[PDB]
Structures are given as C-alpha cells and as structure tokens.
C-alpha cells in the first residue's frame, strides 16, 4: 500500500493522517534510548530514558481521565462549541493538516481538556447508579 512512515503524513490532510496513528503511537517510547555508568554520555542517556516515559505517561494520564484508555480514536460527549472553530467538516478533514489545525485550536486546547475531564467523571457516576439495581 502506502506506508509513509513515522510522521510521514505530517503534511497530509487530517483525514488521511487519521488512518496511520499506530505509526506514531509505537515510536513514543522505543528507539535506542546495560549498566548505569554515570559518565557524560551515561548521565545524558539516563535523562533521555526517564524523559521518554515521563512524557509518554502524561499523555496516557489525560487519555485515562477522559475514558479513552488504550484508544487511538475515541468519541466523546462534549459538543463542538463553534467558537472554537467555525470551519465545516469537509474543509477540516479534506483540507487542513494536523499541524495547522493545532495552530488555530491552540487557545482552546485547555478549555476542551476540562470538558472531557468532568464529562468522564459524571459518566462513570451515571454508570454506577444504573448498575445499582
């Protein structure tokens, strides 16, 4: 088929990049990063090791508090406030790239992260009350 490679679809449309997410997901913790000798290269490599797991788990932490654990494409119950981006679907997924999309959605990325957070807290509270009978 195609298989562009790691970040190979960085310039492709959002919909086309949304079909090769495993390509980036698997390289978020591996690479080349057995004794711990504290030389100038050893201290350098140890930090490179702790830094990878740290950043990897911070993304999985947010993915957990949203109810999206172990997911690449999860859907939510947070509606799209058009003040975030009034662009239409066809001019988003068949037009923009993820890089320029993140550039314009950047202001509201912290707002959306809160709506996904409490929506998961209330949804799990709803599921518990439904299983109380």
């Amino acid at each position: 088929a195609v298989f562009l490679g790691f970040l190979g679809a960085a310039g492709s449309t959002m919909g086309a990049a949304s079909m090769t997410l495993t390509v980036q997901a698997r390289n978020l913790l591996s690479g080349i990063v057995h004794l711990l000798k504290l030389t100038v290269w050893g201290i350098k490599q140890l930090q490179a090791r702790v830094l990878a797991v740290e950043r990897y788990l911070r993304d999985q932490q947010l993915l957990g508090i949203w109810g999206c654990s172990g997911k690449l494409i999860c859907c939510t119950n947070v509606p799209w406030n058009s003040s975030w981006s009034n662009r239409n679907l066809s001019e988003i997924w068949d037009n923009m790239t993820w890089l320029q999309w993140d550039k314009e959605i950047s202001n509201y990325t912290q707002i959306i992260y809160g709506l996904l957070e409490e929506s998961q807290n209330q949804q799990e509270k709803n599921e518990q009350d439904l299983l109380a009978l």
């Binding site: 662009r87 239409n88 066809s90 001019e91």
Partner: protein, 105 residues
C-alpha cells in the same frame, strides 16, 4: 446541454428557485452539481457544491437540492445584491465542470 431557467424574479424577503437539468450525458444522479454566483465580467463566487453543501461563509438562505432529473438552487430572503447571473455546473471527482446556460435573477 445543461439547461438552466430562462429567467425569473421575486422581491425583498421572498424566495427564488433556479433550475438546472440535462440528459444522461451531464445529469444527474451520477454527477455532482455546483452553483456559482457570477456577476457578468467579474470575479465569480462559489455558493454551493456537492448538490447542496454551501461554501465557507455562504448565507444559509442559499440552499441546493438535486432530484434524479434536475438540480435546484433556492434563494430565500432576497436582498439587493442578489441581482446577478447564476450558473450551475456538473462534474465528477476526476473530470471537468460543464457549466450551465445561465439564469438572470
């Protein structure tokens, strides 16, 4: 070959309905219809594509509809700037956009 309405008019607040039809060569159920607002001798404007999808910023009063034999363009709630000439267009994903005859509104 893609015939449009001869002409028609309305009034401020009312609505219009432009027509666009043709034979099996350029219409319809296996083709997409785009509606261009085109003042004579000026920069045109894309109003609606894919039979009924509006372009970014097009007023919601513009609406497209496609039957199995003729595509339509409704222009509800008229305004002064509506006095232009409209042209329909039939296309597929990998071809050309055969324009229409024209419709003075």
């Amino acid at each position: 070959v893609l015939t449009q309405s001869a002409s028609v008019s309305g009034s401020l607040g009312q609505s219009v309905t432009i027509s666009c039809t043709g034979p099996n060569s350029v219409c319809c159920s296996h083709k997409s219809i785009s509606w261009y607002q085109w003042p004579p001798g000026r920069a045109p404007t894309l109003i609606i594509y894919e039979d009924n999808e509006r372009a970014p910023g097009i007023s919601p009063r513009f609406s497209g509809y496609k039957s199995y034999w003729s595509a339509y363009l409704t222009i509800s709630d008229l305004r002064p700037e509506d006095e232009t000439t409209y042209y329909c267009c039939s296309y597929t994903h990998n071809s050309g956009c055969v324009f229409g005859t024209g419709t003075k509104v």
